[PDB]
Design an enzyme around this catalytic site. Structure first.
Site: not given
Ligand SMILES: CC(=O)Nc1ccc2c(c1)CCCC2=O
Ligand SMILES: [Cl-]
Ligand code: NA
Ligand code: NA
Lengths: 301, 302
Positions: A41, A143, A145
């Site tokens: 993503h 942040g 991820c």
């Protein structure tokens, strides 16, 4: 003596954490050999949250649209491919700090350490368990991820989790390092909700054995139970069913302490009925379910 | 979202851990520049530990009596000396993995990460607080002596603890890296016990703020209190006194959540006097006191 929620030393993973940027989005990537793994993503814009067509988004990118920064150094992306929900960016430098590693998909109840990271820089390490509903109760800010979960066998890092998203109840969902999500979740912003969570019965039992090993016996009783009667009671408290596999797995701890598995099940049944009556077990006033049988043997003796 | 007991990444300290062997005793050492630091009790036999004279035992040892192993590579000891209760082994090679570092002595109530080690090999990392009674509630087995505690500020490792012994209640005692014990303990096999402990009030309040930041608000109430009134309550429940410096330090959390410290003290007052009424806070049925205000700000904003 003592019993702590202990994480693995994180250094072998710290040396693999990088920053991945695509457009305005920056998250974390995992650099092993000449590949950087990150959530796919990262290629989504604000328009692509609900129904992204990752194949269509990705075909429009070239290698140089992905900026990968390792410490101060920019790495050169020389290839890219998608595997399930992870992006694999091929880079022109093998990571000299790559540890011995493998990718392992874990089952609910298994524990692992999380190295929380922001902008490719590690922030903290903590211990997590895969909940029966396939979420994890992590600590993650925007942040984070691409932060990963892992165990360390001897010197071999077993990567088992990559962080993708936070669900509305504040718990977290992610993939294995082959990009397959744990649970029924998808990398879309459509309404999805974690199933009702349950307590990891085999782990609570492991932790009760740990309390006995460390010298605490107050919660034992003179009774036993059949496995089926135990499960009929425990499910009324939202405890996971205990299987014969779980009974077998507790064999070693049962042999170390002299307490048969079904006798410990009887103690657990009584604890669910009575509470702790102002007492604690290993410093907790609740029954702890994020230590596996293997964790207990590793930390105790 | 979420709130976990979180340790600093331990990589910079893992690169400094070595195995130190003297006679039949092997434990852990900290290799920084060209010096390996470890507990001076490494030189004692079991009989020696009953009543050690450390300077006398040390004069009898030569450099080659200290076998130091960095991974699979032996280090050559070229000098040895004592600073308080830590042995300093000068070696022939500086550690190429030496991080930027300082030796700091921490105050009771402050937290740090422990890298638990066995035979110079890191095994686990966890977060600890220095208790008011100067012990730590660690998790250590035989062979863990010389494991260290630390904080990281930017890129600098602040080493604050080296493990020496376990007390009879199962809690742990050690020194700073200059060999000064935390607490009224000695490195000798004699009768020693942890003093009665108290709860770290400013840390409980910090954790209550963390709970509020994470949506756990049921314990908030309309009331406020005064420092003097609250400290009578704290004294009654074996809580450390709350000082004005503590209130100042929580200032940021008070402004962000809209709950003044004495407003939160009124919540804590009611929790102490009435319990939690079957509810939990951040998944705990006990009031947690091993997160400092700094820990909460760092984890909820950083
Ligand atoms: C080899 C040996 O006997 N080690 C040993 C034994 C006991 C103790 C200590 C070290 C240090 C702290 C106090 C203590 O009780
Ligand atoms: Cl009032
Ligand atoms: Na890094
Ligand atoms: Na109030």
């Amino acid at each position: 003596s003592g019993f702590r929620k202990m994480a693995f030393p994180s250094g072998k993973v710290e040396g693999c954490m990088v920053q991945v940027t695509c457009g305005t989005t920056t998250l974390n990537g995992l650099w092993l050999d000449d590949v950087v793994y990150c959530p796919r993503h990262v290629i989504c814009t604000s328009e692509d949250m609900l129904n992204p067509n990752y194949e269509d988004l990705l075909i429009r990118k070239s290698n140089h649209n992905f900026l990968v920064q390792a410490g101060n150094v920019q790495l050169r992306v020389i290839g890219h491919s998608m595997q399930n929900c992870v992006l694999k960016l091929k880079v022109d430098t093998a990571n000299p700090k790559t540890p011995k590693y493998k990718f392992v998909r874990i089952q609910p109840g298994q524990t692992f350490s999380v190295l929380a990271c922001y902008n490719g820089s590690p922030s903290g390490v903590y211990q997590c368990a895969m909940r029966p509903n396939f979420t994890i109760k992590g600590s993650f800010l925007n942040g984070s991820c691409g932060s990963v979960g892992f165990n360390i066998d001897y010197d071999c890092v077993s990567f088992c989790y990559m962080h993708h998203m936070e669900l509305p109840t504040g718990v977290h969902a992610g993939t294995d390092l082959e990009g397959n999500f744990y649970g029924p979740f998808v990398d879309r912003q459509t309404a999805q909700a974690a199933g009702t969570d349950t307590t990891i019965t085999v782990n609570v039992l492991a932790w009760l054995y740990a309390a006995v090993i460390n010298g605490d016996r107050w919660f034992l009783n003179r009774f036993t139970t059949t496995l089926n009667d135990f499960n009929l009671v425990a499910m009324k408290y939202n405890y996971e069913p205990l299987t014969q596999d779980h009974v077998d797995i507790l064999g070693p701890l049962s042999a170390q302490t002299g307490i048969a598995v079904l006798d410990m099940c009887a103690s657990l049944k009584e604890l669910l009925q009575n509470g702790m009556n102002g007492r604690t077990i290993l410093g907790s006033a609740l029954l702890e379910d994020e230590f596996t049988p293997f964790d207990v043997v590793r930390q105790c003796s």
